[PDB]
Coordinates of C-alpha atoms in Angstrom, one line a residue:
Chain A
X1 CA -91.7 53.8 -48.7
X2 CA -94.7 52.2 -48.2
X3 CA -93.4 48.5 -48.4
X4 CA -95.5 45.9 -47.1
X5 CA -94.6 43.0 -48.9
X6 CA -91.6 42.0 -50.7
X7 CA -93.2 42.7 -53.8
X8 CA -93.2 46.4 -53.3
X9 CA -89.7 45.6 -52.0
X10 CA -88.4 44.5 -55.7
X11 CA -90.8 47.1 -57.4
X12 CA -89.2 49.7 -54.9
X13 CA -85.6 48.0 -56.3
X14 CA -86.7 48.5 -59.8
X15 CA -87.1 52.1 -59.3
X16 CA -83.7 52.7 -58.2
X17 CA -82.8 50.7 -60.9
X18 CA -84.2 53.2 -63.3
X19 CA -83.1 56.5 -61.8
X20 CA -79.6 54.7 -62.1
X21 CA -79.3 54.1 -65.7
X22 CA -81.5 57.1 -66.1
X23 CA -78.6 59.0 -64.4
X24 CA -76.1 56.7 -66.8
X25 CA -77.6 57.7 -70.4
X26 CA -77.7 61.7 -69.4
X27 CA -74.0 61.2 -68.5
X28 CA -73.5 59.6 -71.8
X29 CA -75.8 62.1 -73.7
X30 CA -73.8 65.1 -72.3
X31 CA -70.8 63.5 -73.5
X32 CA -72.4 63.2 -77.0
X33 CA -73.5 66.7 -76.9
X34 CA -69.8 67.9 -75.9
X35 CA -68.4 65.6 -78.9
X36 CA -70.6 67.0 -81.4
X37 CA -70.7 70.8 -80.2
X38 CA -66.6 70.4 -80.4
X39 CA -66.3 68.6 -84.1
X40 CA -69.2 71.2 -85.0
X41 CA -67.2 74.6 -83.3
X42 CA -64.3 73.2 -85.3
X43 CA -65.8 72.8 -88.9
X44 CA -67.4 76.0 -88.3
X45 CA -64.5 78.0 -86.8
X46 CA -62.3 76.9 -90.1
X47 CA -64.5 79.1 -92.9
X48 CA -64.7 82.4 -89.9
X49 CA -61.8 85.0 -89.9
X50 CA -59.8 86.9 -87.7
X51 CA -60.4 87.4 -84.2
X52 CA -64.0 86.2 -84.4
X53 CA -62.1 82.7 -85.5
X54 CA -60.0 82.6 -82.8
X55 CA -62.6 83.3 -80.1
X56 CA -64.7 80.1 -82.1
X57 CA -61.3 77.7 -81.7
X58 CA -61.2 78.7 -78.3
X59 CA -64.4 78.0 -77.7
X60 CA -64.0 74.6 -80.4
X61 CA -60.9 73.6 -77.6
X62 CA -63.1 74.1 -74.6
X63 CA -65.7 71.3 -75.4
X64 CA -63.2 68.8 -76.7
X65 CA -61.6 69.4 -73.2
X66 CA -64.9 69.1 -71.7
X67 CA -66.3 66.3 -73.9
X68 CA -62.9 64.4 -72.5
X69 CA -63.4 65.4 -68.8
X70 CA -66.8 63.7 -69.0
X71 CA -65.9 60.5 -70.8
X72 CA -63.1 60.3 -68.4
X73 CA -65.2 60.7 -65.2
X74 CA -67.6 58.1 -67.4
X75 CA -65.4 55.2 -67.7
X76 CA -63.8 55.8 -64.4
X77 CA -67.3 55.8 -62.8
X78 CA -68.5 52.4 -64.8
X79 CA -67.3 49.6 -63.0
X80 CA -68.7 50.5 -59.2
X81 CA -71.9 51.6 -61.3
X82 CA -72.0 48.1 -62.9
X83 CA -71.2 46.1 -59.5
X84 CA -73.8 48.1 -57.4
X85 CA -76.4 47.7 -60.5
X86 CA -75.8 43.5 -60.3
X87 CA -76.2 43.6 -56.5
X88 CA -79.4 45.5 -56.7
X89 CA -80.8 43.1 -59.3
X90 CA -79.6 40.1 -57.2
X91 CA -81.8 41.8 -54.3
X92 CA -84.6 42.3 -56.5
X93 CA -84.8 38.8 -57.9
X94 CA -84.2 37.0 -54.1
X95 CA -87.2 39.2 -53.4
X96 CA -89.3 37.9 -56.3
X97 CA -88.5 34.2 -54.8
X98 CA -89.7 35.1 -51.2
X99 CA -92.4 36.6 -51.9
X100 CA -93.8 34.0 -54.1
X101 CA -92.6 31.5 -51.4
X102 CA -94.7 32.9 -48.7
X103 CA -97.9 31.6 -49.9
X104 CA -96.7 27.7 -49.5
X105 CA -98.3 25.5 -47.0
X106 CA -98.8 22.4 -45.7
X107 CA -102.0 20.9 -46.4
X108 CA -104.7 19.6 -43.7
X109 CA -105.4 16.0 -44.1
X110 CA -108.8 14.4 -43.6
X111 CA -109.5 12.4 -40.3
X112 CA -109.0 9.0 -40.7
X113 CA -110.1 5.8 -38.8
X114 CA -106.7 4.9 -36.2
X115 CA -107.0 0.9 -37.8
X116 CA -106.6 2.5 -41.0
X117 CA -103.7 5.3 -40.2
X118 CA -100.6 4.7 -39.5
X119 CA -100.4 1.4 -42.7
X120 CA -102.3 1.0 -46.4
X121 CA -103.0 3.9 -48.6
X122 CA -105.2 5.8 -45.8
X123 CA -102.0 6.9 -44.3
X124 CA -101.5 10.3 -42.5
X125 CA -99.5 11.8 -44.7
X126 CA -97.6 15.3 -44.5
X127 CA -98.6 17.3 -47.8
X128 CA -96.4 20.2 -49.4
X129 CA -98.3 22.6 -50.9
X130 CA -96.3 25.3 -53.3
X131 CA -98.7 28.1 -54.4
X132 CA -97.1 29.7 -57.5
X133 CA -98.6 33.4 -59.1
X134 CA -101.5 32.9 -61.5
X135 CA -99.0 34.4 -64.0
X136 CA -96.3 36.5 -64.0
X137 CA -94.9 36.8 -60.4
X138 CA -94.4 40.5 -58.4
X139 CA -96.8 42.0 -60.9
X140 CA -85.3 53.6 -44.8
X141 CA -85.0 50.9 -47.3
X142 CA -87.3 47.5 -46.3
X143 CA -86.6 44.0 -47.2
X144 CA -88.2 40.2 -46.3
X145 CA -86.9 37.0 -45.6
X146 CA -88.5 33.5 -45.1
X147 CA -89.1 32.7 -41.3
X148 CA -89.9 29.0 -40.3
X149 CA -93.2 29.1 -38.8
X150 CA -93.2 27.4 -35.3
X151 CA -95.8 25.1 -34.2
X152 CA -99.0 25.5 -32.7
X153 CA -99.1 24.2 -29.0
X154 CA -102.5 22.5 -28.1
X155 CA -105.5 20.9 -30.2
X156 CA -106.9 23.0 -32.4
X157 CA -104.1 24.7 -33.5
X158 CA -101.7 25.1 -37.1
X159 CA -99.4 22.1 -37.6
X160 CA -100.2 19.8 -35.5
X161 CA -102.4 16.4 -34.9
X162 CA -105.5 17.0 -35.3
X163 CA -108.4 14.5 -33.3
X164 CA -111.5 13.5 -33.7
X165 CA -114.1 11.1 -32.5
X166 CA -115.4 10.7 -36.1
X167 CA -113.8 10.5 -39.1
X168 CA -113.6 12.0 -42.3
X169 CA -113.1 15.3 -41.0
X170 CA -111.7 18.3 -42.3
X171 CA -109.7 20.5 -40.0
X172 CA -110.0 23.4 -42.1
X173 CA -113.4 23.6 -40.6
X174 CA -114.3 20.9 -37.7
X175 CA -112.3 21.7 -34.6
X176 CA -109.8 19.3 -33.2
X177 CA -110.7 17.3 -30.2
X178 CA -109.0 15.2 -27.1
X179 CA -109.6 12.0 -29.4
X180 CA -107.3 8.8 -30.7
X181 CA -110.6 7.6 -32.5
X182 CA -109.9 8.8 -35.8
X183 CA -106.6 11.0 -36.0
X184 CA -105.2 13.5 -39.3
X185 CA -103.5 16.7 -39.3
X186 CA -104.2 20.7 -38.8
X187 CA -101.5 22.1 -41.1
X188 CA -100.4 25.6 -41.3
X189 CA -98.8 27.9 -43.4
X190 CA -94.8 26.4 -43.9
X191 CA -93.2 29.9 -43.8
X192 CA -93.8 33.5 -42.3
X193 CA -92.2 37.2 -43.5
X194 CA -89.7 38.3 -41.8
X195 CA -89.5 42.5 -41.8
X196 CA -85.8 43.6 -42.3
X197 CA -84.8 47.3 -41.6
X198 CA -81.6 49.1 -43.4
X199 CA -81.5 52.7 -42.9
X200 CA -79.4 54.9 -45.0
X201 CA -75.1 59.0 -46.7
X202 CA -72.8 61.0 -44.7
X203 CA -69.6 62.3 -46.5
X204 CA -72.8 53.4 -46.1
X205 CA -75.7 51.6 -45.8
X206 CA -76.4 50.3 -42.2
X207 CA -76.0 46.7 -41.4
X208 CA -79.0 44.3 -41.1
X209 CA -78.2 41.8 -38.9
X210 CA -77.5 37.9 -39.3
X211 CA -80.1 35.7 -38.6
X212 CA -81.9 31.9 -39.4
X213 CA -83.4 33.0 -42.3
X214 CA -83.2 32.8 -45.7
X215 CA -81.7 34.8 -47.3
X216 CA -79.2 35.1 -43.8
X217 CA -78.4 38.6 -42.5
X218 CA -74.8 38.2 -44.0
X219 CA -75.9 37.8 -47.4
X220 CA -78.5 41.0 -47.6
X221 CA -75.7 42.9 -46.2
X222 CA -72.8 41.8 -48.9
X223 CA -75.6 42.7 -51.5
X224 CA -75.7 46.2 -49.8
X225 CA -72.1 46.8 -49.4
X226 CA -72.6 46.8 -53.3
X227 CA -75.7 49.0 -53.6
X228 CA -73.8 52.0 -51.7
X229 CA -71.4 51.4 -54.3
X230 CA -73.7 51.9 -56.9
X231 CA -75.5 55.0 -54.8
X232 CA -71.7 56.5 -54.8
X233 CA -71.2 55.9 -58.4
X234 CA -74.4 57.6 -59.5
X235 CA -73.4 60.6 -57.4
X236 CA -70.3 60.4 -59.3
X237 CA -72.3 60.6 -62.6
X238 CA -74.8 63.5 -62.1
X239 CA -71.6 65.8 -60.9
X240 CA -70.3 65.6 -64.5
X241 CA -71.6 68.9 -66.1
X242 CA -72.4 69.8 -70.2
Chain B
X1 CA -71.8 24.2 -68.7
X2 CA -71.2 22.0 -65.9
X3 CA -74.4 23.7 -64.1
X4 CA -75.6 20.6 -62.0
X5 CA -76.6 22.7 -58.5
X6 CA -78.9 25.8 -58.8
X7 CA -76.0 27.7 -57.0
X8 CA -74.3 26.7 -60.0
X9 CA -76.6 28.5 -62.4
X10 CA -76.1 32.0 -60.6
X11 CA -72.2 32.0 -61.0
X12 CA -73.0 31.1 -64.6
X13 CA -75.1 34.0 -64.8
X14 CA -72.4 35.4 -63.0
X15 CA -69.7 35.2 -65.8
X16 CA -71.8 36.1 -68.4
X17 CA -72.8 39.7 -66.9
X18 CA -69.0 39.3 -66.3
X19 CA -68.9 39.3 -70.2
X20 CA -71.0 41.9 -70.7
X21 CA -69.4 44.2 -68.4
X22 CA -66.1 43.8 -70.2
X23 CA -67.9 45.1 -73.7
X24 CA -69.1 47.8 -72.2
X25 CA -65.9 49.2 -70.7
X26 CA -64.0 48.1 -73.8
X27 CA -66.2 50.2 -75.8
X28 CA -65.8 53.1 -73.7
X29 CA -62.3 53.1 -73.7
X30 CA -62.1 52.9 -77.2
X31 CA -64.5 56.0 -77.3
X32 CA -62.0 57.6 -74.9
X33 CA -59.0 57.3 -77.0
X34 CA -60.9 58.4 -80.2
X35 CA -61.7 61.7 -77.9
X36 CA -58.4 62.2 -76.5
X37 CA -56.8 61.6 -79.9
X38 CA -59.3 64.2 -81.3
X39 CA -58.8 66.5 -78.6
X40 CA -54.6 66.4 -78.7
X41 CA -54.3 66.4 -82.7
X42 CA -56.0 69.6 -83.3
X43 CA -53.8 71.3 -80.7
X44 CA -51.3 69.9 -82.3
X45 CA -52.5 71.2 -85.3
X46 CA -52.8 74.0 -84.2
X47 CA -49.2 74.4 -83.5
X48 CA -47.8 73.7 -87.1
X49 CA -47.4 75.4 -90.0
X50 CA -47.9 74.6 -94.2
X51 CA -50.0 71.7 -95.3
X52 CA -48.3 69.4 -92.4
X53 CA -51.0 71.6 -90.7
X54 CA -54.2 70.6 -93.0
X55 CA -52.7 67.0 -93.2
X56 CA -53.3 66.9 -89.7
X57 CA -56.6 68.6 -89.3
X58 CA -57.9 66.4 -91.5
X59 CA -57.1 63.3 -89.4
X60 CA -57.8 65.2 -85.9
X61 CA -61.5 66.0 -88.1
X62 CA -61.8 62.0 -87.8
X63 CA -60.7 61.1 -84.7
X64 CA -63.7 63.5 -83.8
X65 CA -65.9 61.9 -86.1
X66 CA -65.6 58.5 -85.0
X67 CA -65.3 59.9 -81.2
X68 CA -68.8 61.0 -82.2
X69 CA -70.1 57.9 -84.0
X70 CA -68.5 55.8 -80.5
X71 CA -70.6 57.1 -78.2
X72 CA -73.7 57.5 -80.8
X73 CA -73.8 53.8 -81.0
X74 CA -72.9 53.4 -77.0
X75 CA -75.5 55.5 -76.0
X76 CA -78.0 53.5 -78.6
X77 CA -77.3 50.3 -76.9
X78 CA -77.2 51.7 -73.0
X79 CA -80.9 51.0 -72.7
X80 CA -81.1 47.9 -74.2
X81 CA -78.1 46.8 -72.0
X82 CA -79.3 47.5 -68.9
X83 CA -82.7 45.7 -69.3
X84 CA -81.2 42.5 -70.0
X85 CA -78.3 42.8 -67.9
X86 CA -80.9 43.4 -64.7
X87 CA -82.9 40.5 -65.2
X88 CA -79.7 38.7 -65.9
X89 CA -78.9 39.7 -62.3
X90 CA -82.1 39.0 -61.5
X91 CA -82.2 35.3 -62.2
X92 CA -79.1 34.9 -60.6
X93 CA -80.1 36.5 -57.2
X94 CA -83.4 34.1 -57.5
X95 CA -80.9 31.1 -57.9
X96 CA -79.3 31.6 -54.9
X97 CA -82.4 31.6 -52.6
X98 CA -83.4 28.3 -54.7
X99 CA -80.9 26.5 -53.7
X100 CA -80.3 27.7 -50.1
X101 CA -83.9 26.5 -49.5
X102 CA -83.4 23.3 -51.1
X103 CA -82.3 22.6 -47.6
X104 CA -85.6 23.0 -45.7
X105 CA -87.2 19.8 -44.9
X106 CA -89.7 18.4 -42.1
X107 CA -88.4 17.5 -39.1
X108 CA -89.1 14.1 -37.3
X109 CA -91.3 13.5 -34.4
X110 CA -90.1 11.6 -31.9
X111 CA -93.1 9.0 -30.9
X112 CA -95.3 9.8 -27.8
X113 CA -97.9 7.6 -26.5
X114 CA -101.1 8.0 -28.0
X115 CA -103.5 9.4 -24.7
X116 CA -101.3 12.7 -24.7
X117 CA -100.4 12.8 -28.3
X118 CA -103.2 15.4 -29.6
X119 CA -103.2 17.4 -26.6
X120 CA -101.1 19.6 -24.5
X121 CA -97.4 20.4 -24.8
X122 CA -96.8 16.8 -25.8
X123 CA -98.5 16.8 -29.4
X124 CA -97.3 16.0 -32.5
X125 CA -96.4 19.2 -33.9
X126 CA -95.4 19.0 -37.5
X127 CA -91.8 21.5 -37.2
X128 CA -90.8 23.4 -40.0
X129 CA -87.3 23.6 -41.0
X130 CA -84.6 26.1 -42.4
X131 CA -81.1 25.3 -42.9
X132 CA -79.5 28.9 -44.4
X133 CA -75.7 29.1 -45.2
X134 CA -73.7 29.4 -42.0
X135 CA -71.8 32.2 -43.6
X136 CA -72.8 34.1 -47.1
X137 CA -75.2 31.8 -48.9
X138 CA -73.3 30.6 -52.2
X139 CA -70.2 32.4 -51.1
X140 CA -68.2 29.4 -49.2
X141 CA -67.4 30.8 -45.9
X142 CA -79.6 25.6 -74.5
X143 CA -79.8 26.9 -70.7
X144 CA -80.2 25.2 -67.4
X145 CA -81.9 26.6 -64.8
X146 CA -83.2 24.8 -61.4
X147 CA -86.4 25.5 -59.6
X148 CA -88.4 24.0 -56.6
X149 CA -90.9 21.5 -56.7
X150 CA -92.9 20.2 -54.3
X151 CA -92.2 17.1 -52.3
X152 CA -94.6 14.0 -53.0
X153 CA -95.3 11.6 -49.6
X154 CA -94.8 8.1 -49.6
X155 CA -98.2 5.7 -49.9
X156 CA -96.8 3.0 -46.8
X157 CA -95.6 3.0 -43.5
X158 CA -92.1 3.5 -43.2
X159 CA -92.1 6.4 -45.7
X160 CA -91.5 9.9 -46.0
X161 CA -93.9 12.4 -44.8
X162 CA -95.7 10.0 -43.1
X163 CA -97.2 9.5 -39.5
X164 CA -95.1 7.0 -38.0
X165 CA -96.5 4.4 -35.3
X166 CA -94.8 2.1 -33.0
X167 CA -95.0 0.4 -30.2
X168 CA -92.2 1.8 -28.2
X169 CA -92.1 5.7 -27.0
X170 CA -89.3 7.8 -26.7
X171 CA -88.3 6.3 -30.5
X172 CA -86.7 8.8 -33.0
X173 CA -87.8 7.9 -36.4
X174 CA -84.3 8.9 -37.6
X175 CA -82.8 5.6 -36.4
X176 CA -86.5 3.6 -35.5
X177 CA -88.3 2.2 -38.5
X178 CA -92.0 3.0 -38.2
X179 CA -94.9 0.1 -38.0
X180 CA -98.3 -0.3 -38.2
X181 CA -98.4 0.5 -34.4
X182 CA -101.3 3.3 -33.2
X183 CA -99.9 2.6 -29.9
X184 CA -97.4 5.6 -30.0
X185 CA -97.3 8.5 -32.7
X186 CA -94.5 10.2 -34.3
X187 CA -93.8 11.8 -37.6
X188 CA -91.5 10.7 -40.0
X189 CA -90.5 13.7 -42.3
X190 CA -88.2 14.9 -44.9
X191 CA -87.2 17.5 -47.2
X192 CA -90.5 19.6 -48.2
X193 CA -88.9 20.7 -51.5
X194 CA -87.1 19.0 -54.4
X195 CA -85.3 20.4 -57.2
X196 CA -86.6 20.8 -60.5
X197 CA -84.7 21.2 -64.0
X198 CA -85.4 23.5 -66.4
X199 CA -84.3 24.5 -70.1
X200 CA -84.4 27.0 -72.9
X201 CA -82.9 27.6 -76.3
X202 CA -80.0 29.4 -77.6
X203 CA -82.4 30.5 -80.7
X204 CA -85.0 32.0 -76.4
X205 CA -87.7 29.5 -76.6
X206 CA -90.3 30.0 -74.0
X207 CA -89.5 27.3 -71.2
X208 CA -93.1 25.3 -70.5
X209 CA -95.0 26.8 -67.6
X210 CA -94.8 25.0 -64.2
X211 CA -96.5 24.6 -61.0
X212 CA -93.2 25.4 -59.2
X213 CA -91.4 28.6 -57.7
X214 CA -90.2 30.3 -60.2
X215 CA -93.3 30.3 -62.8
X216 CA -92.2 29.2 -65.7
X217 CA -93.9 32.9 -67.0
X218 CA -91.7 34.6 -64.6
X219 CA -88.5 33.0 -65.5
X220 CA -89.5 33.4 -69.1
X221 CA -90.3 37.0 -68.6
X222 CA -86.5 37.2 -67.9
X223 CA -84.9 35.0 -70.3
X224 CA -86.7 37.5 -73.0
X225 CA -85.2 40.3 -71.7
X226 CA -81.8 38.3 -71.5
X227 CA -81.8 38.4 -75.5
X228 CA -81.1 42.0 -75.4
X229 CA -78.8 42.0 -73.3
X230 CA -76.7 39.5 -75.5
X231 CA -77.9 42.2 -78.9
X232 CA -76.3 45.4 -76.6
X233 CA -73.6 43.3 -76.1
X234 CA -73.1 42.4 -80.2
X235 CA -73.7 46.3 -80.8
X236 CA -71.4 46.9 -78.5
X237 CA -68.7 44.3 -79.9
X238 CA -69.4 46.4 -83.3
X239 CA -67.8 50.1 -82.2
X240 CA -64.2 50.8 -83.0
X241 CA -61.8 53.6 -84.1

């Protein structure tokens, strides 16, 4: 469980992902095997004799029983499976879109003269700045959320109004000073990740709690409500035997 | 398709995994009742007499057979169905974070006088934002797909994401217009994120890449595997007594 970023978070979702329908198609294979080994007793059972052939129907009637049993327990087990599958994607993807949102900013701008500031094209202006993957993105359960990052509280410090007594500056590397003479703006990263706990089966999947975030506490949580579905569903799935 | 909100997009995504879903059980239940038919013919075979006894074997022999075939082809189709159905769920659980941070936006600064305006606990700080759902985000209380883009500021005073000067204090740039004032600095600021469309094709084509959250590879990377999920769901459509 090493999860450090939200990344590993959706890589760690696609994993459980896999052991569930890996769980799904052994269900469904044992069920194949059942069918087949009952059509197969049955055809075979019909050319024996005698006791021998009553001992092969008996044995014919035993996996059409159990090739029933399991599609039974399949179908039954389906739609929980399905639900808990849908959630867990739904978790996997909202991960994909914070973690990829964690690397916007807002961009420093470059001192300016205080005449030429506030009016004109040499305006202080407040710059987004999205910073999407080179490529393809994300390439005691943990999960992230997007914080709001507060404000810096003095001079040189992230998002706030940078001074100097000279202009052109770049806060990225000059310090801010005590100065009106030429003003622009020490910007800062827009967001921070938020760490969010949800510890695990007795017989339930803890509750993380709400928050100003996004996604909200109450949102994660209806998406695990689902997942333990799912968890209880693939338990249902291995117990069927072939 | 109606999808005019990125919130919308997810319950569209929604209905279709809906869909799929449907298939899926359908098909197992009609594998169930070839088995069960299978299963209670030959004991009832079993229990006659005369060619009333071979008649029946013979159609017991095929309500196995197809049993057989059923779960042959939904077995075939399991893996394909899953990997599109969990990007499917996938883009829907991005779309819902989309549009509950289409609400973040800069916040104003009220204006300050200029001698303690980059120093101290009076600056101008530049406040981040976030307006999530008071409740359950998106839950109340040819495709089209939304992603965010980034905000452009204005070029004049007045104007969003600007810094705003007057020659007042105390003035909240919600209800004060801003002036070519350095006497007092504020911030005038807005949303920091704008909405973005986005398309495909129902024969998928790959949707151009962007500079916006989603990547227009990442999205695409989904929308491929959304194809077989709609070709499980036709082989599913395809099984039958």
């Amino acid at each position: 469980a090493q999860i450090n970023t939200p990344c590993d978070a959706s890589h760690y979702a696609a994993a459980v992902a896999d052991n569930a329908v890996s769980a799904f198609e052994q269900a469904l294979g044992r069920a194949q095997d059942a069918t087949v080994a009952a059509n197969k007793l049955h055809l075979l059972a019909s050319k024996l004799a005698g006791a021998q052939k009553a001992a092969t129907t008996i044995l014919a009637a035993a996996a059409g029983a159990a090739a029933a049993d399991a599609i039974q327990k399949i179908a039954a087990a389906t739609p929980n499976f399905a639900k808990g599958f849908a959630a867990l994607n739904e978790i996997k993807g909202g991960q994909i879109i914070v973690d990829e949102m964690l690397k916007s900013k807002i961009e420093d701008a470059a001192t300016v003269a205080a005449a030429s500031s506030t009016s004109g094209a040499t305006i202080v202006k407040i710059k987004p700045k999205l910073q999407p993957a080179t490529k393809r993105a994300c390439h005691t359960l943990t999960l992230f959320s997007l914080k709001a990052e507060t404000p810096g509280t003095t001079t040189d410090q992230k998002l706030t109004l940078c001074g100097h007594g000279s202009p052109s500056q770049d806060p990225a590397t000059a310090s801010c000073q005590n100065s009106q003479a030429n003003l622009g703006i020490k910007g800062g990263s827009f967001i921070v990740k938020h760490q969010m706990q949800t510890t695990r089966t007795t017989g339930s999947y803890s509750a993380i709690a709400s928050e100003d975030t996004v996604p909200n506490g109450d949102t994660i949580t209806a998406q695990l409500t689902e997942i333990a579905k799912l968890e209880n569903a693939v338990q249902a799935l291995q117990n069927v035997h072939e």
